[PDB]
């Protein structure tokens, strides 16, 4: 009360100082149980790539995507994520990924 009124002496009354809120007791993390790794290798290490005018699209689904292997590698000269942060990619689930 003293620090919310900014006075070493506070006269009688009822003063609102702060807000009481319960704190979480346990941390719950939920995800679907899928084991197979996403076949990123067949995309980045593909022997042949399609011409830009006919850019290839691959559907990535029903797999675990360890994006760290991608953004911790030194093999890429440009890595730019728009609307997402690459570090956060390990804590997100996507609808249906396309490469």
């Amino acid at each position: 009360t003293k620090c919310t009124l900014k006075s070493f002496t506070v006269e009688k009354g009822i003063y609102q100082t702060s807000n009481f809120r319960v704190q979480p007791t346990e941390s719950i993390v939920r995800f679907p149980n899928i084991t197979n790794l996403c076949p990123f290798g067949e995309v980045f290490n593909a022997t042949r790539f399609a011409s830009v005018y006919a850019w290839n699209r691959k559907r990535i689904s029903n797999c675990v995507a360890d994006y760290s292997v991608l953004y911790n590698s030194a093999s890429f000269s440009t890595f730019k994520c728009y609307g997402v942060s690459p570090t956060k990619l390990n804590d997100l689930c996507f609808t249906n990924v396309y490469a």
Partner: protein, 166 residues
């Protein structure tokens, strides 16, 4: 999708293509558990303001705490419509309101400790009404009372250019 709150069994009927619900405030209201096909309703866990009923440091340093609009089971304890009061004794006697808590409950400092009571509106006084009885004064008093009214403020002026861009 991260957040904090209480998860409870829901009675919502999610469609197969819907993952999570939403509230009018566009905040998530319910979710589908990714491993068990069950709908969990999300309710934010209890919160509310905290007020410090104090008799004033001039007379004492003892204070009572009012948690607003919460149940005492959730926080010398007293439950009132205003909330949960801790550090004040509940007294059946009634007095004039000194520090208003709410819902007809006021707190004071009396012999010492802080007490919470149901404020008294006034002294009960039945009028001796009768169809042939009048009450006429035989004497009077000339009373001088004081009425204070504000009439003006301080004529403040702000130099906006110097305030924003001194």
């Amino acid at each position: 999708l991260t957040g904090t709150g209480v998860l409870t069994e829901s009675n919502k009927k999610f469609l197969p293509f819907q993952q999570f619900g939403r509230d009018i405030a566009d905040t998530t209201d319910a979710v589908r558990d990714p491993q068990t096909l069950e709908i969990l309703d999300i309710t934010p866990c209890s919160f509310g303001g905290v007020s410090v009923i104090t008799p004033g440091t001039n007379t004492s340093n003892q204070v009572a705490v009012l948690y607003q609009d919460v149940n005492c089971t959730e926080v010398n304890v007293f439950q009132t419509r205003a909330g949960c009061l801790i550090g004040a004794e509940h007294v059946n006697n009634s007095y004039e309101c000194d520090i208003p808590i709410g819902a007809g409950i006021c707190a004071s400092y009396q012999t010492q400790s802080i007490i919470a009571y149901t404020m008294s509106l006034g002294a009960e006084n039945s009028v001796a009404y009768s169809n042939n009885s009048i009450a006429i004064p035989t004497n009077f008093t000339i009373s001088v009372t004081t009425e204070i009214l504000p009439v003006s403020m301080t004529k403040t002026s702000v130099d906006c250019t110097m305030y924003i861009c001194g």
